Symmetry: C2
Subunit: 278 residues, 2 copies
């Protein structure tokens, strides 16, 4: 709304444009959207054609293709180079002459890569408070500090909500210890976080309130066995089975282990499945 | 163990298979991957052809089409129905007879939908500790609690996120205040958290250690201005501009506001820009 569109490879790039005169392209930082520049643009519109971009991963811009799987790697250069190319292609569609460019924060980093890889579109460029470290002395120190902070923030946020969730459902301590144990590797721990966040957004609410009724069980009563772990007593999922059994007559079979008894006590769990179905 | 693949609409479904005899399909819960059943499958492989599935969004399975946008909706049934469909088409591809099926946790919910919508593929089925609340007398209490845990993770990321911006970028706290001001609708707040998580994983490490050298600046030193805010003195980004200035001679221009001075002091910011470029 109020925004123009430039279609590029993998994205529809949306930007605000106001004013008259030489093109001045503003590149946003962490918020990623050009609206943060509109009060500044109002002050400038008599001297520049001000262009404030939503970078392709943000705001009203939209990817038309998924990012490469490699983009989640901390060393990936795909996004920063693609953002820089976005600016250069937006510059050429708006002007035949080199333009004015200002980026702030990560936007200044994009602007450095515009200058490096497409200097032909740069008349003048400004780097407002850039947080890049690569050329600093001992830049590995700052790279490692950033990698650590990101790791800490992501992993710590989920463990709080995962404790609360466990206490709500009265999951046994044994079970909660094991379905929250952090993976033995670096990539194992990241995949855990991604897995848990997908589960939170896309599974737990959708599945636990899905359209199942007791009528759906009684039709096929003779086929159903309900399994409660002998080490997970008092937890919410056992109450769910207790209710099904109360209202349908379908029997509960007790089985070793807790909520994860199939991995906690494999031989014991198996023995019971053979009792049932062997 | 190499996994088997079944190509379905929208996904390559991957699964482990061991043993002989009637088919027995294990459906995983929140971890989403069948490998959690491999010790149990070893106990049963003399009696059943054991099949332990990676549900299509997890593990070695892979989507071949994006998830629908509406899958994010807490009331969406796309994923659980598609999960149940996957199991039934797996059963038909493995066996001309109805098969044995066991799901645990959210996998037992998938198993309920398999029995409900594809009863013809179920010989016998076990629901191990299901966390579904829909048919319970107090469903609403459990459902509202789940929505609330999910809501918790969102709002804790919001406030931890103000701590993130000031501690990842090392910037004055008034600037981190503005960078983390809550969006003014709930839908906007959900997008805000996604935008912070994306920036945290996909932007800050990749950009702040991208391949810019001081030689890249000296080559176009005449085009470049470094911008430091007058209200954000002391921060790491100003230290970066100080180092660039020290090594290349490129001038630093002070400009009103802090790290976000273009919106904090738009007319003071513009006046400086016009002295540089107007």
């Amino acid at each position: 709304p109020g925004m123009e569109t430039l279609e590029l490879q993998g994205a529809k790039l949306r930007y605000h444009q106001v004013g008259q005169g030489p093109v001045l392209i503003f590149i946003p930082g962490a918020n990623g959207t050009g609206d943060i520049f509109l009060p500044l643009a109002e002050q400038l519109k008599d001297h520049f054609t001000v262009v404030a971009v939503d970078r392709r991963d943000y705001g009203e811009s939209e990817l038309t293709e998924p990012l490469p799987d490699s983009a989640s790697n901390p060393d990936s250069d795909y996004r920063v180079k693609r953002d820089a190319q976005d600016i250069a292609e937006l510059a050429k569609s708006l002007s035949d002459e080199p333009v004015y460019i200002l980026g702030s924060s990560s936007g200044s980093i994009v602007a450095m890569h515009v200058l490096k890889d497409y200097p032909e579109v740069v008349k003048k460029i400004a780097f407002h408070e850039p947080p890049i470290n690569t050329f600093l002395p001992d830049s590995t120190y700052w790279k490692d500090k950033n990698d650590d902070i990101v790791h800490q923030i992501l992993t710590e946020g989920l463990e709080k909500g995962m404790k609360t969730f466990g206490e709500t459902l009265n999951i046994a301590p044994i079970d909660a210890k094991m379905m929250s144990q952090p993976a033995d590797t670096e990539e194992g721990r990241i995949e855990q976080y991604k897995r848990t966040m997908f589960w939170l957004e896309f599974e737990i609410r959708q599945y636990t309130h899905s359209n199942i009724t007791l009528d759906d069980f009684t039709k096929y009563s003779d086929k159903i066995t309900l399994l409660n772990g002998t080490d997970s007593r008092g937890s919410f999922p056992q109450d769910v089975n207790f209710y099904i059994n109360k209202e349908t007559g379908i029997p509960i079979v007790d089985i070793p282990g807790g909520h994860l008894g199939y991995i906690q006590k494999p031989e014991g769990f198996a023995d019971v499945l053979l009792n049932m179905w062997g």
